[PDB]
Scaffold this active site. Structure first.
Site, PDB file in Angstrom:
ATOM      1  N   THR C  34       0.875  -1.379   0.028  1.00 32.05           N
ATOM      2  CA  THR C  34       0.032   0.072  -0.026  1.00 32.05           C
ATOM      3  C   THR C  34       0.888   1.235  -0.186  1.00 32.05           C
ATOM      4  O   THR C  34       1.930   1.266   0.779  1.00 32.05           O
ATOM      5  CB  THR C  34      -0.706  -0.062   1.315  1.00 32.05           C
ATOM      6  N   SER C  35       0.411   2.177  -0.386  1.00 33.35           N
ATOM      7  CA  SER C  35       0.862   3.652  -0.516  1.00 33.35           C
ATOM      8  C   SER C  35       0.976   4.056   0.952  1.00 33.35           C
ATOM      9  O   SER C  35       0.134   3.910   1.713  1.00 33.35           O
ATOM     10  CB  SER C  35       0.401   4.595  -1.582  1.00 33.35           C
ATOM     11  N   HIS C  93       7.726   0.113   3.908  1.00 33.24           N
ATOM     12  CA  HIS C  93       7.321  -1.037   4.565  1.00 33.24           C
ATOM     13  C   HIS C  93       8.499  -1.766   5.127  1.00 33.24           C
ATOM     14  O   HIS C  93       9.866  -1.653   4.716  1.00 33.24           O
ATOM     15  CB  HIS C  93       6.317  -1.806   3.425  1.00 33.24           C
ATOM     16  N   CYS C 135       7.672  -1.810   9.668  1.00 33.73           N
ATOM     17  CA  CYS C 135       7.097  -2.812  10.603  1.00 33.73           C
ATOM     18  C   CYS C 135       8.167  -3.778  10.562  1.00 33.73           C
ATOM     19  O   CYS C 135       9.117  -3.970  10.056  1.00 33.73           O
ATOM     20  CB  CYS C 135       5.802  -3.674   9.776  1.00 33.73           C
TER      21      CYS C 135
END
Ligand SMILES: [Cl-]
Ligand SMILES: [Cl-]
Lengths: 240, 4, 240, 4
Positions: C34-35, C93, C135
């Site tokens: 995702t952006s 990410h 993350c």
């Protein structure tokens, strides 16, 4: 009263807290784990060091993985209301994320989970220190010539070595890390914040130790400890 | 010197 | 001269050093990533914050994994002789041990290895700071109501979140961690040692943020950053 | 709020 600051943990409860020392030296033959010569030197040094910091020290020797889990569970079910902090020292074989009982490995997360903010309520908001002398893998460092809170908050892991690396123990003098930790606590616990003490430990291990081995693979190697802090306040062992 |  | 102490890194070289900011917002469709709405807020905050600390800031946007590796390699081959330190901020990410390029993952160890004490000689003995908003897994925190040196020495990893856990980013305000880090640097960089600044960041994230989600699985969750220090000295951004 |  006047202006108040809350940048440091309250360390003037009636008791500093428990210091649990798990000293695994002799392992079941079937594990294939070598005896950890020198670890009794570490355990004795730690006992004295934390005694002088006014911790209630409990030394345990040669525990199975089942005994470690039971001990941790039972300690986490004690009433720590009158205690400022909690300290657990693990001296054993290990891998990344893993500490050895005398009969095999235990997940570190299993041990520490007992003390989560939601699972040990009398330690919620208090510093929970896990000091770990154990390998974290098999890499060798060649060196170079020169209102809720998270359930994982208020933990500190003082690891003897970098992620992925062996950790070094001298059979006569004790481990490089525990040697250095006790020396720096002795010298600076009445004058430095704990992260700054551990930074002096990092420098001592990094600069004053180098392995000697007849095996070229293991010779002339270096070590850097790793501080893993999820603390939310400064920690001083003294108060007032 | 030994490793853990 | 008189008595000299060497407990803190020399930070009065002609230059503070580089601050490389890798800001990955838009990912290739085929990755399924995702952006990362809000990350431009982080990148701008970081640019300003480190500008005021006198770092040479270089902002890079939307790099592929190949571009990240090449950038890091090239930066590590610069002459850092006149620079006090090195800072790299990664906004992307991630998983445990992993940061995402726009077209897929890169091992964090690949990036940081370029700056090892034996591989970047003009940074040997100088602090190398890696600040990582990404993350580290998919766990959610439910909270609770209240003479050689090691080649791995002199690194510090300021992780936004605990090992194994998601890290939270607000699409309007930026990430909880980078928000808090910039605020604490702004307030305390001229008066606190860096570990103590990062401890204030831990407290801010832990106490002042909680997720809001229409999805019960992701709602009311908490975060604690993790300081991973292999530094051997105290680090102050000011000198003299 | 979103996760990375
Ligand atoms: Cl022994
Ligand atoms: Cl944005």
């Amino acid at each position: 009263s006047g202006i108040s600051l809350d940048n440091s943990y309250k360390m003037d409860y009636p008791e500093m807290g428990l210091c649990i020392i798990i000293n695994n030296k002799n392992f079941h033959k079937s594990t294939g784990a070598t005896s950890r010569s020198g670890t009794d030197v570490d355990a004795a040094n730690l006992r004295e060091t934390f005694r002088n910091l006014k911790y209630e020290v409990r030394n345990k020797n040669d525990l199975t993985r089942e005994e470690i889990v039971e001990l941790m569970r039972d300690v986490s079910k004690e009433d720590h209301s009158k205690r400022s902090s909690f300290v657990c020292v693990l001296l054993s074989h290990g891998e990344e994320g893993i500490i050895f009982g005398t009969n095999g490995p235990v997940d570190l997360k299993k041990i520490t989970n007992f003390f989560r903010g939601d699972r040990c309520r009398s330690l919620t908001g208090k510093p929970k220190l896990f000091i770990i002398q154990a390998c974290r893998g098999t890499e060798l460092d060649c060196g170079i010539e020169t209102h809720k809170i998270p359930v994982e908050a208020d933990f500190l892991y003082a690891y003897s070595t970098a992620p992925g690396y062996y950790s070094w123990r001298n059979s006569k003098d004790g481990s490089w890390f525990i040697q250095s930790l006790c020396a720096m606590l002795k010298q600076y616990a009445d004058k430095l914040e704990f992260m700054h003490i551990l930074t002096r430990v990092n420098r001592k291990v990094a600069t004053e130790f180098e392995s000697f081995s007849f095996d070229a693979t293991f010779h002339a190697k270096k070590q850097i400890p790793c501080i893993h802090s999820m603390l939310t306040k400064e920690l001083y062992f003294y108060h007032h | 010197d030994e490793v853990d």
